[PDB]
Design a protein around this ligand. Structure first.
Ligand SMILES: CN(C)C(=O)CCOc1ccccc1Oc1cccc2cc(C#N)ccc12
Lengths: 401, 521
């Protein structure tokens, strides 16, 4: 029976009272079976009406199985504990992790269901299994062990993690390990086969010391602020369009001289035209790949990510903290069965992992979707144990990239 | 009875203490009444007389079809801990699972039958008056903050043993009510109910007897629940001089009646109160509204009924366009009998958009009510849906849908082109407007410049110059502009709008054989 680390909210703060979302019957039976086993194992206990707190609960489909997972939305409790509870016991974010050629991601959350949770903090993990059509008051529970998805869980467990990881970290001094929520981020400059063996040694080393792992390869060497460019080809339409995006560009980088190429007609001309302007575009293209300076990350400011529907199973994204200030740019793609919604889900889960490695925080998302549609189907493909903030966009200007 | 149930422990908000409100003796004949009640209450354990052991106090009252006690607990309520929410919503008759027999057992003396936590009783003290007799509460006081939630918890526990032994029977818990259904013979069912009564009796909970069991139709939360069908209680809407208040009450009744009465349309009547206005401020009756209400009285002239839910049968929703941005839907399991109905609205947008929005409203409701999404039979074809979204900027997804040909079908009234054409023109169209005083043009023929106007907005002018580009336009054509405003509007491929000028541009775009637009800085 380990000694329970006490947890205090930033004084002047109450506990979460988020309302539970309505769920489908398939998912409620799932949560009822999960929750029943969890109550036999002692991990959760039913509670009374004198607990006012609530946080939302969802069900997801884990990696790929029938096996249903329970997913708790501690976004509210995180903002009211981990803020100054991380400052108390925080995980330092390792800067080199962005540099390594491969980064794999180990789920280590099941381990938390061992360390007991401090008795005076339990009431704030109240959650509710809903019923259908208001037939019954929901089923109510709180946690007695560290819940998955509470950012205070890794903070408390980090001492146990460091002890089990002490030997692996010396025999392997070159490897960067980062813990974020229920995930263990491992980066090495090894070859893919070599990297995969080292990971398999790590999982094995972790398994045998108790820490149950499941038993996602990222390549941040290939990530940068990708520059806006255009492949070579020029009609008037092509000229005018190319003329356009250069104007939007003068913003993210004052230096373009579109007027040099602008020399054109001034009658029907949607046909073809021969291109000095060739020289002007050549110099600009050099300035285009120039890394925009003046781009600084402030930890006080939050991270905002925006996504745009390109088409044909591909999506483009931009992460900033201030107007322009484009700290990262990139692309997402898929083969198949992807729909407008499901791809976005996978996109977001790729745009979050990237900000976690780079800056150790998740970004608050602006999303290209009707709110209610998102709220209905996001869990149908969600497979991360975390949940980013998100708001819904309405008016898509032709940013032209 | 006081009840052998355990008590929910109560605390006071951290660092607070009991209310010390004093009473103003008011009537003294009422004091003779209040002594009568409080003597009975001490006679059944509900309240007990207390000494002057430095207790707190709360007001009293006597308000009485012609009395009745009413302690004001507002001051205690403000210092008592917070409890779990009670029941935000109400179960929908469409969601109710069909049952052979149903029974409405109304518990009696609900709150007074559940003991209150000992260590918190001191704080419920109320004095009765030229000295004053003292009293505290032993059971859940009426109007106390934690009475509703602690009764609900207590009733949920008292039922667990009997449910255990009776997995077949289904009991709904609402407020001070139990709705109790089974699939067994009446004689069997009347026996099971009578067992429920005795179970509840042992715990301190009185119930109606067989002669006093409410009989159907049940008039409940504004419905008529019949044995195998349900409907709304008779909606009643009257003169000529109306108020904001009268308009609001009316739109309430037609939204209300629209869950089973299909085709209700309340748009016209709604826009009338669209401004802050007042409540008594009389409002004029628009003629199109007097039509809506005339149509509405026709829907409500005859009755219609919903059926109850069968989770074995499958769920089918249908949508049919009404016009004017209004849509109407019906969920059923068999084609005649609707589980329920409803309608959608929008606040300038293409039909497929507003259609896929309606499917959203239905999915949300289907999950709230049946825990399942409804299979859909819509008046549209893949060709129409697939292309709209695939070139829609926004993400969208629609569950299983089969085509039904019930005009008005929704379709793409027009469509822009993706690449330029085999030669038409330019139409570079500008809208110069002096924000100080009240443009238009094309350089294909160069026959630019049609007409300015007073109070004409540069945004209206640029969009009108694109419509002006449509003037010299013939068949396959290509326009251009430096106004981002214009581009977003026609690109959204809207099929109706408030400014008919933009509706004219749709008529132009609908008429022209192949269009392709572009923007330049
Ligand atoms: C409702 N009915 C006649 C059916 O035939 C549909 C089957 O309704 C029930 C199913 C199980 C338990 C109880 C059921 O009955 C009810 C469910 C919910 C609210 C009710 C409110 C009143 C009143 N006042 C009466 C009965 C109610």
């Amino acid at each position: 029976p380990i000694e329970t680390v006490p947890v205090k909210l930033k004084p002047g703060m109450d506990g979460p009272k988020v309302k539970q979302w309505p769920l489908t019957e398939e998912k409620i039976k799932a949560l009822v079976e999960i929750c029943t086993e969890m109550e036999k194992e002692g991990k959760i206990s039913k509670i009374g009406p004198e607990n006012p707190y609530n946080t939302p609960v969802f069900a997801i489909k884990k990696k790929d199985s029938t096996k249903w997972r329970k997913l708790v939305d501690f976004r509210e409790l995180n903002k009211r504990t981990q803020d100054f509870w991380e400052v108390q016991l925080g995980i330092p974010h390792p800067a080199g992790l962005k540099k390594k050629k491969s980064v794999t991601v180990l789920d280590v959350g099941d381990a938390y269901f061992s360390v007991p949770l401090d008795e005076d903090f339990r009431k704030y993990t109240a959650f509710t299994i809903p019923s259908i059509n208001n037939e019954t008051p929901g089923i109510r529970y709180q946690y007695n062990v560290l819940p998955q998805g509470w950012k205070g869980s890794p903070a408390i467990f980090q001492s146990s993690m460091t002890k089990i990881l002490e030997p692996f970290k010396k025999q392997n001094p070159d490897i960067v390990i980062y813990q974020y929520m229920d995930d263990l981020y491992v980066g090495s400059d090894l070859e893919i086969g070599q990297h995969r063996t080292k990971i398999e040694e790590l999982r094995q080393h972790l398994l045998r010391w108790g820490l149950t792992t499941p038993d996602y390869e990222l390549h941040p060497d290939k990530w940068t602020v990708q520059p806006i460019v255009l492949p070579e080809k020029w009609t008037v339409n092509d000229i005018q369009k190319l003329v356009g995006k250069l104007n939007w560009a003068s913003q993210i980088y004052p230096g373009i001289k579109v007027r040099q190429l602008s020399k054109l007609l001034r009658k029907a001309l949607t046909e073809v035209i021969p291109l000095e302007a060739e020289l002007e575009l050549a110099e600009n293209r050099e300035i285009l790949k120039e890394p925009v300076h003046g781009v600084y990350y402030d930890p006080s400011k939050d991270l905002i990510a925006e996504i745009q529907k390109q088409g044909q199973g591909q999506w483009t994204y931009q992460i900033y903290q201030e107007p322009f200030k484009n700290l990262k740019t990139g692309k997402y793609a898929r083969m198949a069965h992807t729909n407008d919604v499901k791809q976005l889900t996978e996109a977001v889960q790729k745009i979050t992992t990237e900000s976690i490695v780079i800056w150790g925080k998740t970004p608050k998302f602006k999303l290209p979707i009707q709110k209610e549609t998102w709220e209905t189907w996001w869990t149908e493909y969600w497979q991360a144990t975390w949940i980013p903030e998100w708001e819904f966009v309405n008016t898509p200007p032709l940013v032209k990239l | 009875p006081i009840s052998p149930i355990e008590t929910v422990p109560v605390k006071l908000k951290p660092g607070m203490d009991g209310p010390k409100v004093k009473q103003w003796p008011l009537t003294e004949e009422k004091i003779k009444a209040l002594v009568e009640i409080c003597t009975e209450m001490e006679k059944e354990g509900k309240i007990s007389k207390i000494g002057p052991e430095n207790p707190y106090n709360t007001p009293v009252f006597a308000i009485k079809d012609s009395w009745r006690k009413l302690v004001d607990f507002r001051e205690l309520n403000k210092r008592t801990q917070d409890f779990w929410e009670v029941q935000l919503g109400i179960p929908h008759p469409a969601g109710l699972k069909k049952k052979k027999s149903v029974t409405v057992l109304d518990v009696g003396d609900a709150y007074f039958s559940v003991p209150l936590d000992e260590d918190f009783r001191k704080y419920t003290a109320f004095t009765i008056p030229n000295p004053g007799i003292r009293y505290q509460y032993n059971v859940l006081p009426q109007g106390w903050k934690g009475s509703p939630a602690i009764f609900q918890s207590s009733m949920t526990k008292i039922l667990e043993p009997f449910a255990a032994q009776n997995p077949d029977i289904v009991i709904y818990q609402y407020m001070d009510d139990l709705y109790v259904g089974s699939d067994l013979e009446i004689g069997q069912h009347r026996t099971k109910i009578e067992e429920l009564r005795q179970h509840l009796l042992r715990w301190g909970l009185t119930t109606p007897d067989k002669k006093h069991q409410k009989e159907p139709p049940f008039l409940w939360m504004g419905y008529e629940l019949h044995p195998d069908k349900w409907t709304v209680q008779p909606i009643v809407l009257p003169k000529d001089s109306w108020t904001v208040n009268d308009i609001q009450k009316l739109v309430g009744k037609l939204n209300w009646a629209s869950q089973i009465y299909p085709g209700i349309k309340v748009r016209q009547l709604s826009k009338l109160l669209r401004g802050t206005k007042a409540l008594t401020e009389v409002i004029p009756l628009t003629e199109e509204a007097e039509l809506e209400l005339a149509e509405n009285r026709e829907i409500l002239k005859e009755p219609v009924h919903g059926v109850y839910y069968d989770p074995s049968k499958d769920l089918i929703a249908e949508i049919q366009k009404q016009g004017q941005g209004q849509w109407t839907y019906q969920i059923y399991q068999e084609p005649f009998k609707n589980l329920k109905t409803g309608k959608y609205a929008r606040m300038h947008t293409n039909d497929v958009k507003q259609l896929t929005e309606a499917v959203q409203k239905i999915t949300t409701e289907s999950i709230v009510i049946w825990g399942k999404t409804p299979k859909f039979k819509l008046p549209i074809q893949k060709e129409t849906w697939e292309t709209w979204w695939t070139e829609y900027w926004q993400a969208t997804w629609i569950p299983e849908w089969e085509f039904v040909n019930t005009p008005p079908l929704v379709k793409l009234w027009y469509q822009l082109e993706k690449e330029p054409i085999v030669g038409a023109e330019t139409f570079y169209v500008d809208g110069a407007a002096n924000r100080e005083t009240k443009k238009a043009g094309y350089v294909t023929k160069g026959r630019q410049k049609v007409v300015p106007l007073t109070n004409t907005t540069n945004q209206k002018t640029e969009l009108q110059a694109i419509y002006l580009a449509l003037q010299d336009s013939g068949l396959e054509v290509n326009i251009v502009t430096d106004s981002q405003y214009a581009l977003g509007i026609i690109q959204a491929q809207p099929d109706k709008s408030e400014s008919e000028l933009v509706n004219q541009i749709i008529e132009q775009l609908i008429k022209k054989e192949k269009v392709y637009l572009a923007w330049v800085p």
